Design a protein around this ligand. Structure first.
Ligand SMILES: OC[C@@H]1O[C@@H](O[C@@H]2[C@@H](O)[C@H](O[C@@H]3CO[C@@H](O)[C@H](O)[C@H]3O)OC[C@H]2O[C@@H]2OC[C@@H](O)[C@H](O)[C@H]2O)[C@H](O)[C@H]1O
Ligand SMILES: OC[C@@H]1O[C@@H](O[C@@H]2[C@@H](O)[C@H](O[C@@H]3CO[C@@H](O)[C@H](O)[C@H]3O)OC[C@H]2O[C@@H]2OC[C@@H](O)[C@H](O)[C@H]2O)[C@H](O)[C@H]1O
Ligand SMILES: OC[C@@H]1O[C@@H](O[C@@H]2[C@@H](O)[C@H](O[C@@H]3CO[C@@H](O)[C@H](O)[C@H]3O)OC[C@H]2O[C@@H]2OC[C@@H](O)[C@H](O)[C@H]2O)[C@H](O)[C@H]1O
Ligand SMILES: O[C@@H]1[C@@H](O)[C@H](O[C@@H]2CO[C@@H](O[C@@H]3CO[C@@H](O)[C@H](O)[C@H]3O)[C@H](O)[C@H]2O)OC[C@H]1O
Ligand SMILES: O[C@@H]1[C@@H](O)[C@H](O[C@@H]2CO[C@@H](O)[C@H](O)[C@H]2O)OC[C@H]1O
Ligand SMILES: O[C@@H]1[C@@H](O)[C@H](O[C@@H]2CO[C@@H](O)[C@H](O)[C@H]2O)OC[C@H]1O
Ligand SMILES: O[C@@H]1[C@@H](O)[C@H](O[C@@H]2CO[C@@H](O)[C@H](O)[C@H]2O)OC[C@H]1O
Ligand SMILES: O[C@@H]1[C@@H](O)[C@H](O)OC[C@H]1O
Lengths: 436, 436
C-alpha cells in the first residue's frame, strides 16, 4: 500500500491534487505536506482572469508561473483554472458587454493558453455558467448576455489555442443527480458532443456541506457524464466537518468510474481553506493528518478486506490478545485505560466516529493530555480536541492526530492491568490492534 | 431574576462573575454580554503587581480603576486580584530578595489596598504559594525565600490595610481532595484559623482540563474548607471543552455549599480566553450562548423538576404530541427531520451530549442547514459545528447555538410528516418539547 495520496491514486492510474496558494509557498510546513502528498496542482487564484490580464491586452503571468514552476519542480501536473467566468473578472472586463466582451473573452483565452501551451493537463475553460435558482438554466452574467453560444465559443477557441490540453467545463452543486442544475449541465455537454463542440471533461467542484450534502447518487452522475464521451474530475473537493466516511465515499465513487481522472481537494491545511470554519480539508492547522486523511488513503489503496465494525466493537492488541479496557468500568474523566481479557461489557466497546474519536459509554473519549512519549491515554468528556482524535492505520496501529504518536502498551506488557500510553510508532505487536 | 447568570445566582444570595480586560470595554459585543450576565468582576490583569506598581514606589491605578469603575457603574461587585504573587511581578521586584523583598511586599499591599479601601468585596491577597511537585509544600520563589511566614504576614498586612475586605488565598490544582497540594493548603488554612491568622476565604481557580480534570470530590473539598470557618469561592473557572455536565456539576457544587459565595468564569467569550484553544468558556467568539451556558443557567435556577435523561430518549413536541423522527430511519446526510407518532425505534432516540449535540444512530447529528428563519433541520455526520449544537431551555424550547433560533414544527403542523425547521423563538407549542 502506498504511503501518500498521490502515489496511492497513481496505483489506479489517477492523480490526487490540491489547490496551491503562491503566497504560502514560503511556508515550509505548507510545502512539505503539499510536495509530499499531491501529484497534481491547481493555482487557487493565480491563473484566474484578473490575475492573468490586469489590463486589457496586457497579460501577467508572474503569479501563475510561481505556482506552475513549483508544481513542475516537484513532479506535479497542473490544472489551469480558469479562463472564462463571471467572477473575479478584472474591472476592465466587468465594464464590458456584447460583442466587445465576446472578443475580450476570446483574446483572454488565447493569451493565457498561448503562454502555457503544452504545459497544462486540464483547463477549466468555463467556470460556473449555470444558475442555482432551480430552473436548470444559465446564470445571468455579462458573459451569458453576449449570447447563449458564449460557452461553445470559449471551448472552440481553447481547442485551437492548445490542442494538447483537456478542456473542462467546471461547476458546483452539480454532483447530486436530482438537481436541475446538474441536469442542465448534462444537457449542454450532451448537445456539445452531439454537435462536435470541443469538450473533453466536466469538473465537479464537490464543495459539500450540510446545505448541499454529498449524495450517494453522485456515482450515477459521474457515470452519466462519462457515458457522453467525456472524462470527469473532482476538482475542488472539501467537506464541511471532513467526515471520514464522506471523504471515503467520494474517493470510491471516482475509483468506480473508469473515466474519473482523479481528485483535487481545495487546499492543504484547514487553515489554508477558503472555508476554514468548516475544517473541510485533510490536514489541520498544525499540519497533522486528520482522520479523513487515513480514510482517503485507505480508500485509494483499495480499502479493507472486511468493513469496519459499525458501532461498538472491541480493540484487541495483537501482541497481548487483550482488549482496550477502562479500569473497573469507571466513567471518571482522567481514568487511564489498560489491557484486559475481552468480554461483553460497555467498558470495552469503542466506537470510531467519522470525526476520528474513539468513544466509550457514549460520551467519553479516548484522550491524551500530552503529546510527548509516556503520555497516559485516558478517558475524558468528548469535546472534539485533536488530542481526542485518532487515525486507524492500515498496519493496525492507532495514531493520535495531535501527537502523531501510537497507542502503546507500556513496556510491551501483555498481562491484564497493562496501562496504555503514547509513544513513537514502531510496528511493535504492542502497538497493533484488531477491530475484532 | 433568572434569565441571566448573575440574576439567577442572586436568587440564592450568590454571584456569577467574569474576568474583565479594560482593553475590551470599547467593544460593544463584549460589554453587551458582560454587563448583562455577570454581577461580579475580577480584573484579568489590571490589578496585578506589575500593572499597579510598574516602578517601585510608583503606583499606577489607571487600568485598574477603569475595570473597577466599569464594574461598580454596571452593578457588579469586585474581586481584587492579586496582591502577592511569584508570577507577573514587575522587573524590579523580580530581582529583589530577602528583607528587601518582604518590605516591598508589604508596601505593595498597603498601596493597592489603600487605594481601593472599602471598595473591594474580596482580595486574592496571596496567589499560588504551593508547589505542583506533589510534596504538598511551598513553591520555591523569591517570596518563599524571604521566610515561610510571608503568607501569614501578607494576610495580617491586608487585614490592617482594609478590614472590610474578605481576604482570600487563591490557587489552582487544589480542587481534587486527594491531591497533596490540596492538603497542603487545607492544613495551612486550618492552622491560620487556629492561630488567629486573618484569612476569610479560599479561592479555587478551577482551571479544569484533561490534564487536571474536574472530579466530583471538588464538592467535598469545598465543604471541608467551609467547615474550617472560611468562605469559599470558585475564582477562575474554565473547562476544556466546556462540557455542559461538568459546568452544571461545578455550579451545583457551589449551590451545595452554604459558604460558597459564588462563581467567576475566567473570561467572557472563548476568544477572550487565555486558553481559547480549549474553548473553555460560556460564550462563543461571535457572542452566542454555548450549550454550557444554558446548563449553568438551569442549574442556578434550581435545575429541572426531574433529573436530566441519561442519553437515548425521545423528544416529543408538546403541541403535536408527536416525536422528533428521522424519516424511514434513514442515515443519509441531508435527511430533514419530522414529527411522527412516538414508538420504540432508533430513529426516534436522541442523545444530548455534553458538547450540546443531539445524536441519533450514534454518529449522526441534528443539523441546521443555515442560520435564518425557515432553515431546514436535518441529520448530518457529527463534526462539532455550532450548527450542530443545541441549548435545552427551561421553557421546553431547543435553541441552535449558531443561529439562536428555535426548533420549529413547520407551519405549526402537528400531523405525521410535519417537517422541522429553525425559526425565531416564540414560546409556541410547536417549539416546545419534552424529553420525559
Ligand atoms: O478569502 C481569502 C482567500 O481564500 C482563498 O482564495 C479564494 C479561492 O479559494 C476561491 O476559489 C473558488 C471557490 O469556489 C469555486 O467555485 C471556484 O471555482 C474557486 O475558484 O475563490 C475566491 C478566492 O478569494 C480571493 O482570493 C484572492 C484575493 O485577492 C481576494 O481578495 C479573495 O476574495 C485563499 O485561501 C485566500 O487567499
Ligand atoms: O496575551 C495573552 C493574555 O491571556 C490573557 O491574560 C492572561 C491572564 O488570563 C492570566 O491569568 C492568570 C491565569 O492563571 C491563574 O492561575 C492566575 O491566577 C490568573 O491571574 O495571566 C496571564 C495573562 O497573560 C498575560 O497578559 C498580559 C500580557 O501583556 C502578557 O504578555 C500575557 O502573558 C488575556 O486573554 C490575554 O491578554
Ligand atoms: O399564529 C400565527 C403565526 O405566528 C406568527 O408568526 C410567528 C411570529 O409572530 C413570531 O415572532 C416572534 C415572537 O416572539 C418574539 O420574541 C420574537 O422576537 C418574534 O420574532 O415568531 C414565530 C412565528 O411563527 C412561525 O411562523 C412560521 C411558521 O412556519 C412556524 O411554524 C411558526 O412557528 C404568524 O401569525 C404565523 O407564523
Ligand atoms: O420515519 C417514520 C417511522 O419512524 C414510522 O414508524 C412507525 C411509527 O409508528 C409505529 O406504530 C406505533 C406503535 O406504537 C403505538 O403506540 C403508536 O400508536 C403506533 O403508531 C409503526 O409501527 C412504525 O412503523 O413510520 C413512518 C416513517 O416515516
Ligand atoms: O462560490 C460557490 C458558493 O456560492 C456555493 O454556495 C452554495 C450555494 O448552495 C448551497 O446549497 C450550498 O450549501 C453552498 O455551498 O458553493 C460553491 C462555491 O464554489
Ligand atoms: O516507563 C517505561 C516506558 O517508557 C517504556 O516504554 C517503551 C519504550 O519502548 C517502546 O518500544 C515500547 O513499546 C514502550 O512501551 O516501557 C516500559 C516502562 O516502564
Ligand atoms: O498558571 C497555571 C498553570 O501553570 C497551570 O497548569 C496546570 C499544570 O498541571 C496540569 O495538570 C494542568 O492541566 C495545567 O493546567 O494551570 C493553572 C494555571 O493558573
Ligand atoms: O476494568 C476491568 C474490568 O473490565 C474487569 O471485568 O475486572 C477488572 C477491571 O480492572
Amino acid at each position: 500500500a502506498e504511503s501518500t495520496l498521490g502515489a496511492a491514486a497513481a496505483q489506479s492510474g489517477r492523480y490526487f491534487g490540491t489547490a496551491i496558494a503562491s503566497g504560502k509557498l514560503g511556508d515550509s510546513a505548507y510545502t512539505t505536506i503539499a510536495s509530499r502528498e499531491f501529484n497534481m496542482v491547481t493555482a487557487e487564484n493565480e491563473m484566474k482572469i484578473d490575475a492573468t490580464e490586469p489590463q486589457r491586452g496586457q497579460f501577467n503571468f508572474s503569479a501563475g508561473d510561481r505556482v506552475y514552476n513549483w508544481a513542475v519542480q516537484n513532479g506535479k501536473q497542473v490544472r489551469g483554472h480558469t479562463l472564462a467566468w463571471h467572477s473575479q473578472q478584472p474591472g476592465w472586463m466587468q465594464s464590458l458587454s456584447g460583442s466587445t466582451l465576446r472578443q475580450a473573452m476570446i483574446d483572454h483565452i488565447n493569451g493565457v493558453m498561448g503562454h502555457y501551451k503544452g504545459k497544462i493537463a486540464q483547463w477549466d475553460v468555463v467556470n460556473e455558467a449555470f444558475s442555482d435558482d432551480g430552473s436548470g438554466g444559465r446564470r445571468d452574467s455579462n458573459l451569458q448576455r453576449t449570447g447563449n453560444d458564449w460557452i461553445e465559443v470559449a471551448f472552440r477557441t481553447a481547442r485551437a489555442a492548445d490542442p494538447a490540453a483537456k478542456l473542462c467545463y467546471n461547476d458546483y452543486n452539480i454532483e447530486n443527480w436530482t438537481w436541475a442544475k446538474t441536469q442542465g449541465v448534462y444537457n449542454m455537454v450532451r448537445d456539445f458532443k452531439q454537435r462536435g463542440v470541443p469538450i473533453d471533461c466536466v469538473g465537479f467542484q464537490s464543495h459539500f456541506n450540510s446545505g448541499s450534502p454529498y449524495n450517494s447518487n453522485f456515482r450515477t452522475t459521474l457515470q452519466n457524464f462519462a457515458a457522453l464521451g467525456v472524462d470527469v474530475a473532482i476538482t475542488e473537493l472539501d467537506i464541511q466537518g471532513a467526515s471520514s466516511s464522506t471523504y471515503a465515499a467520494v474517493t470510491n465513487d471516482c475509483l468506480a468510474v473508469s473515466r474519473c481522472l482523479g481528485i483535487t481537494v481545495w487546499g492543504v491545511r484547514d487553515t489554508d481553506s477558503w472555508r476554514s470554519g468548516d475544517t473541510p480539508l485533510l490536514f489541520n492547522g498544525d499540519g497533522s493528518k486528520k482522520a479523513a486523511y487515513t480514510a482517503v488513503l485507505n480508500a485509494l489503496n483499495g480499502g479493507s478486506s472486511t468493513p469496519p465494525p459499525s458501532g461498538g466493537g472491541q480493540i484487541k492488541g495483537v501482541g497481548s490478545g487483550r482488549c482496550l479496557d477502562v479500569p473497573n468500568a469507571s466513567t471518571t474523566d482522567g481514568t487511564q485505560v489498560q489491557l484486559y481479557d475481552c468480554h461483553s461489557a460497555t467498558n470495552q466497546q469503542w466506537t470510531y466516529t467519522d470525526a476520528g474519536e474513539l468513544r466509550v459509554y457514549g460520551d467519553k473519549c479516548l484522550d491524551a493530555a500530552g503529546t510527548g512519549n509516556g503520555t497516559k491515554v485516558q478517558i475524558y468528556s468528548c469535546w472534539g480536541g485533536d488530542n481526542q482524535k485518532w487515525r486507524l492505520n492500515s498496519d493496525g496501529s492507532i495514531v493520535g492526530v495531535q501527537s502523531g504518536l501510537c497507542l502503546d502498551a507500556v513496556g510491551g506488557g501483555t498481562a491484564n492491568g497493562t496501562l496504555i500510553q503514547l509513544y513513537s510508532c514502531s510496528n511493535g505487536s504492542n502497538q497493533r490492534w484488531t477491530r475484532t
